[PDB]
């Protein structure tokens, strides 16, 4: 057996790779990152709890067919996922430096939204068009009205929105199913 199959999971997306046992894992890591639209260095890949280095081969690490590699977002400082009393979760990926978003203000953001299996359902960046809304105004889903509060301009926050703070039992747009948890990455551009 000259080749093996490896699964990379980021906790949402699961992608399989067929690779020669003597090929550096760089190729797999770069192929995985390419798909998620990121640079290989923005991610950490773990095998058996140990970070993979790009020059290492499957043979080097004694990997077997159908072994699993976990992909985590590089977050140097270390992050904290916050869970509020409503059940909303959020994590500041980058802290802003600018003014703070407060309820009642009109704010402008870029965003991407995904389902929990990793499927992208929308992004403002796809239309190169920042999105403005009145924070706390009931014109966006509740998880946004809560979750964007306290962001500072320049900040990137990742919201994990349970369905009662999203589209509930009815879903949305022929794409978001009933009872969907939603993941958004939101960048605050202006307040």
Q: How many residues bind Ca ion (CB under 5 A)?
A: 2
* Annotated binding-site members for Mg(2+): 129-130
C-alpha pair distances (Å), 69 with each of 38, 48, 51, 73, 118: 17, 8, 10, 13, 16
Give yes or no: 47 in active site.
no
Candidates 10, 60, 67, 122; catalytic one: 122
Taking CB under 6 A as the rule, does residue 47 contact ligand 861? no
Q: CB–CB of 159/150 below 8 Å?
A: no
Backbone angles phi, psi at 40, to 5 degrees: -55, -40
C-alpha pair distances (Å), 190 with each of 55, 124, 133: 42, 15, 11
Whole-angstrom distance, CA of residue 32 vs CA of residue 64: 19
Q: CB–CB of 152/124 below 8 Å?
A: no
Torsion of CA 36, 38, 42, 47, to 10 degrees: 40
Beta-carbon neighbour count of residue 160 at 10 Å?
A: 19
Give yes or no: 184 in active site.
yes
Give yes or no: 90 in active site.
no
Q: CB–CB of 28/16 below 8 Å?
A: no
Among 39, 59, 74, 129, binds Ca ion (CB under 5 A): 129
Give yes or no: 141 in active site.
yes
User: x/- site string to ligand 861, residues 108 to 147, per CB under 6 A?
Assistant: ---x-x-------xx--------x------xxxx--x---
Q: Which is nearer to Ca ion, 130 or 162 (CB)?
A: 130
* Annotated binding-site members for Ca(2+): 129-130, 190-191
Residues 162-181 within binding reach of ligand 861 (CB under 6 A): 167, 172-173, 175-176
* Annotated binding-site members: 129-130, 190-191
Q: Which is nearer to Ca ion, 115 or 189 (CB)?
A: 189
Report in angstroms how near the CB of residue 140 gets to ligand 861 at its nearest: 4
Residue 82 interacts, among Ca ion, ligand 861, none and using kind-specific CB cut-offs from 5 to 8 Å, with none
Q: List contacts with ligand 861 (CB under 6 A).
A: 111, 113, 121-122, 131, 138-141, 144, 167, 172-173, 175-176
């Amino acid at each position: 057996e000259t080749h093996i199959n490896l699964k990379v999971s980021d906790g949402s997306s699961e992608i399989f790779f067929k690779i020669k046992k003597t090929t550096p894992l760089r190729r797999l890591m770069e192929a995985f990152a390419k798909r998620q639209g990121k640079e290989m260095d923005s991610l950490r890949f773990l095998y058996d709890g140990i970070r993979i280095q790009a020059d290492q081969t499957p043979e080097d690490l004694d990997m077997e067919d159908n072994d699993i590699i976990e992909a985590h977002r590089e977050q140097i400082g270390g992050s904290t996922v916050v869970t509020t009393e409503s059940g909303l979760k959020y994590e500041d990926l980058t802290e802003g430096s600018g003014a703070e978003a407060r309820a009642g203000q009109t704010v402008s953001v870029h965003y991407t939204g995904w389902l929990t299996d990793g499927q992208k359902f929308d992004s403002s960046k796809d239309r190169n068009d920042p999105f403005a809304f009145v924070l706390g105004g009931g014109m966006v889903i509740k998880g946004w009205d809560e979750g964007v509060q306290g962001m500072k301009v320049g900040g990137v926050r990742r919201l994990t929105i349970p369905p009662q703070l999203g589209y509930g039992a009815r879903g949305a747009g022929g794409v978001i199913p009933p009872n969907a948890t939603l993941v958004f990455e939101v960048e605050l551009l202006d307040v």
